[PDB]
């Protein structure tokens, strides 16, 4: 069914119930894959960002005002809004650098070849691409869930776990 995209794994297979990777063009599928990779990268970072500041609030490690009322990371919109604005601005600037340099079709290769490590063979690479994609998918789901849950009952993740009797700490 698929056209050679490195994705697709044993748990399910080629997951495409709605029929999008048959009604698209050769360039459209490339853009879809890029969209996937990028969303995943951001998400993964955002999940780690939700976890660590919130925990540092739970452990009294940043003072008694860090995420003041509850401890939710969605509370930065109340305490320090301009900091969040400037951070989104810096992200936007570096991503404008991306949009300028990278050309249509790439938009994912940061040319970070020597600055980091990489698998030496070729099969392992295919595996690492599949991994990046899978971690990104799981992170997308996790971020959506965290945001929805916190907007439902204003309460941090670890505390929502502690209450309601889902952990043992």
């Amino acid at each position: 069914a698929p056209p050679g995209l490195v994705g697709a794994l044993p748990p399910v297979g080629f997951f495409d119930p709605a029929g999008f990777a048959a009604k698209a063009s050769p360039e459209e599928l490339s853009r879809y894959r890029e969209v996937e990779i990028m969303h995943g990268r951001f998400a993964q970072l955002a999940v780690l960002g939700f976890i660590i500041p919130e925990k540092c609030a739970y452990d009294g490690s940043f003072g008694d005002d860090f995420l003041a009322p509850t401890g939710r990371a969605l509370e930065v919109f109340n305490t320090d809004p301009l900091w969040l604005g400037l951070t989104l601005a810096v992200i936007s600037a570096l991503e404008t650098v991306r949009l300028i340099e990278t050309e249509p079709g790439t938009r994912t290769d940061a040319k970070i070849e020597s600055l980091g490590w990489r698998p030496k063979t070729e099969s392992e690479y295919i595996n690492y691409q599949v991994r990046e994609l899978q971690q990104g998918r799981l992170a997308m789901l996790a971020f959506a869930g965290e945001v929805a849950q916190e907007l439902v009952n204003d309460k941090p993740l670890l505390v929502n776990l502690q209450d309601s009797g889902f952990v043992s700490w």
């Binding site: 044993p10 698998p119 030496k120 063979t121 392992e124 595996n127 690492y128 952990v167 043992s168 700490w169």
Partner: protein, 164 residues
């Protein structure tokens, strides 16, 4: 080295961080020896954690002490005199390097046909036991440094029948 005992589903060849990239057969043989020995030790260690929870020997390790008073987990490395621990260590070493009270020919059965399958099974069990021994060590040591810190009481938390 993509075809050597240890390749089993789901993960075909689990060398993600490129360790078998540029190595000769000697180094991979050393790695396999370390893996097999580690696995065997881990399996014996897990069995050792479980069994003293419902049975203790009838002798008296160390001058006093007695085998039925010693704590069960990460402790008992500080409740047995150091000389006895050193002697046990060196005896295990004698069995390890010299291979002494550990090579009896009645210990190498004729695995008619099934040799590779049984080698693969032994390696896989070693892997599982290595992870299990890590979990047991973490739970015990953490709940020893600060009683609690996990909520889960008891040392072998998982088999509640032993009431421990």
């Amino acid at each position: 080295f993509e075809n050597e005992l240890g390749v089993i589903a789901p993960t075909g060849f689990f060398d993600p961080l490129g360790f078998t990239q540029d190595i000769d057969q000697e180094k991979f043989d050393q790695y396999r020896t370390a893996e097999l020995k580690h696995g065997r030790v881990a399996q014996l260690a897990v069995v050792g954690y479980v069994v003293p929870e419902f049975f203790r020997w009838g002798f008296d390790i160390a001058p006093g002490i007695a085998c039925a008073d010693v704590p069960n987990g990460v402790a008992a490395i500080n409740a047995i005199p150091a000389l006895g621990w050193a002697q046990i260590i060196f005896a295990i070493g004698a069995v390890d390097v010299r291979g002494w009270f550990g090579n009896f020919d009645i210990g190498k059965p004729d695995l008619k046909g099934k040799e590779e399958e049984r080698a693969l099974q032994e390696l896989q069990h070693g892997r599982l036991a290595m992870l299990a021994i890590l979990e047991l060590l973490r739970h015990d040591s953490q709940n020893l440094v600060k009683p609690g810190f996990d909520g889960l009481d008891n040392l072998i938390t998982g088999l509640p029948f032993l009431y421990n």
